[PDB]
From a paper:
The yeast eisosome, composed of the BAR-domain proteins Pil1 and Lsp1 (hereafter, Pil1/Lsp1), scaffolds a membrane compartment that senses and responds to mechanical stress by flattening and releasing sequestered factors. MCC–eisosomes are relatively stable, and have been implicated in sensing and responding to plasma membrane stress: various stimuli, including hypo-osmotic shock, heat shock and mechanical pressure, cause eisosomes to flatten and release sequestered proteins to affect signalling or transport functions. Here we isolated near-native eisosomes as helical tubules made up of a lattice of Pil1/Lsp1 bound to plasma membrane lipids, and solved their structures by helical reconstruction.
We isolated MCC–eisosomes from S. cerevisiae using a gentle purification procedure, preserving a lattice of untagged Pil1/Lsp1 structural proteins bound to a presumably intact plasma membrane bilayer in a near-native state, observable as a two-layer density in the protein tubule. Although MCC–eisosomes have been shown to have a furrow-like half-pipe structure in vivo, our isolated eisosome tubules seem to be closed, continuous helices of Pil1/Lsp1 proteins. Using a symmetry expansion and density subtraction strategy, we could refine our structures to a resolution of around 3.2 Å, which allowed us to build models of the paralogues Pil1 and Lsp1. Two novel structured regions of the protein were visible in our maps: (1) a folded N terminus (Nt) that forms lattice contact sites with the Nt of a neighbouring dimer, followed by (2) an Nt amphipathic helix (AH; residues 39–48) buried within the lipid density of the cytoplasmic leaflet of the bilayer that runs parallel to the BAR-domain helices of each Pil1/Lsp1 monomer.
Numbering used by the authors:
A (entry chain B), B (entry chain A), C (entry chain C): 1 to 271
The structure:
Amino acid sequence: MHRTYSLRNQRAPTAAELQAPPPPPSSTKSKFFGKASIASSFRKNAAGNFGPELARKLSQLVKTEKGVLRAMEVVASERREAAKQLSLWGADNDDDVSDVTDKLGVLIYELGELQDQFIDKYDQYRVTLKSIRNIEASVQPSRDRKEKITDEIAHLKYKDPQSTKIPVLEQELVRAEAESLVAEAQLSNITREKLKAAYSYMFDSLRELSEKFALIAGYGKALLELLDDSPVTPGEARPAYDGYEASRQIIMDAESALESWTLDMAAVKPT
Amino acid sequence: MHRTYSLRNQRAPTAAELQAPPPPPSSTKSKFFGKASIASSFRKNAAGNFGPELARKLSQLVKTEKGVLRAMEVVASERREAAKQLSLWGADNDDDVSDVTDKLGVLIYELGELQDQFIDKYDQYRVTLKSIRNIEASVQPSRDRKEKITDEIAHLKYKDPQSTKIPVLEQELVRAEAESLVAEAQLSNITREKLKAAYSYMFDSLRELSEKFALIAGYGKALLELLDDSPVTPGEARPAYDGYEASRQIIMDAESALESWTLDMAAVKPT
Amino acid sequence: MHRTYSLRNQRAPTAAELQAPPPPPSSTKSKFFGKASIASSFRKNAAGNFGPELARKLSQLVKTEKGVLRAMEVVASERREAAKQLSLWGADNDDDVSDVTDKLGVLIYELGELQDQFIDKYDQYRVTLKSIRNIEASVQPSRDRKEKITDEIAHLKYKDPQSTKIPVLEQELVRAEAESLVAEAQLSNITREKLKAAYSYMFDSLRELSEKFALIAGYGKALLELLDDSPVTPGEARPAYDGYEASRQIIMDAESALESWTLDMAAVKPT
């Protein structure tokens, strides 16, 4: 992150914040738990309660992303209702506002739909995180077997070196040594390859959602241009709205840029 | 939106979907209400229960966005925990994975922080939506007075034209006519100006969040390049990690592009 | 401070830590309040209980440094006892150890004495912090008078513009305006000059204590050179100690460098 050289928690303002000062904190700071009700919070402790020690963190990790999915499902679905209600209010308004508002509802509807595709790809990233969780949890019992083996041979050797079980326990240590070694190496291999692929796919989904979000946001700015802000005095009639086809053409250009999106092209060019 | 010429609900695939087929639907389709618990749903009906008829839709609208804010608050805060837990797991892994993972946790932390600023600006857009709700709700009683006036004069005229209250009720109709006319005109004025300003600011916040999201996503892709996917065979040691400063420099370029973001420049260029 | 680009609290190791790994955390983590008993903690809240609002932070600040002084008084005095007890143990040991140990006790005694001078200068810095506290606390009642004045004139003007007290209250606002302005300007002046002088003197005391600490520490390292670590086998006598004058001369050089310390010279040369 970006932080200032001060004991204060507040960081240095961004160049974007220089032009527009940051708004006051949101008035939705509920005086409650604030973390996806109670069942999710109790579930969070349950992952580390009765799971393998090695995979306890991963058992939380994959399921924690389910909390991301469930919360984002509400965001996508409930914001979808906002587009429903927004375009509905356009009726009890003048024609110019009605056309702009319901068109904005279409654009927000697209915002929600793209979000839903993002949650689907997010689920796929969660699924492969579950897969690496599964193999790591399968590795753990071998570690259990190995430490049990060295514990027994150490205890038996301490008791007496003439025990007949130590000749076979020494080979059992070598047994488990090669046993654990082969899949410890592939555990690093599969973790590296799967994490790289999963997060490359996840960031690909993030880039897809991000650029689509930006394209609709900018074209909504162009859509908002057909919104007269003239302060008409009372007693005088309004000229009739005429930008019906102009807003219609704006959507067509939006759809044209929507259906012509390939990963080869990218307006965002990191340095 | 984009839909195909078919009675089927499924739409035509996007060019992005042509390269990568869409993933299967998420496994988080809970068999429950699925809309921000029950209190929000019961609250949604309450807005239209005991409110002014004109502002019933707006009373829902501004408060519905509070449901967006509350749900997004969970998303921002609970995904923030995912960055916490992800970087924590980097300990019980090789050094290369540890450096990449905790750096990814930093980038996701920035993702959450930018989300929080988005919710703050979203609250401001909700607040001005509350303001237009307030004035429209203040307009409603005049409509109540006007229809009551014409109802009384019509009923009195039907009963008898010689009633002494009709001479003053006729002027009362003109009274309320000019009364309602002046602020009906400004109601259209303030609704148009405030909606345009609020949604221009909201789309400005959306563009800000979108481009910042994309910048961090792309630089995370560059960060992921320092992740060897070589399938090392068991029994052979690994060369030591060396991309400590390379990943450090990647963040510096990310911060440099982060602190040098102005609305004058925009990589996204709509056609 | 120096922190790493990770959500982990642990920072990047220093170059000094690279040569010598950091030791495990101290075993003195008492399961108690741990902040200078209870009276100091209760006193800390008392400073902000019944004090002027403007000087509440400074009233804590100057007195908080008394907590530094009281705690450092214990450190200086109780470590002074450690030098007493250390040199005492030198009796029931061989002559070589006895000479080295009691000489080390002398050096630690000097360590304590220099600490005491540091606490004295620390008290002076605390005293001038009390002085700026006093003047700022004296400024506060004028702010009280000014806001009371504007409150009364606003309330009286709201009640009626014909009130006879408003003609004199308007001049009273100008009265307090020039009143507050003259010492607000000097408040900034005196705060800047006094804080600069106090912390320059405080850092001068810190530099004095620091370099004296280092000089005694290094000469103690030279003193420790007269300490044979040979593993003498049992049954063989030891050669008699002879470095009596060598350790005596080491102290003389230490005292010679001690009495020849001027602020013009400084081994520490910041870049």
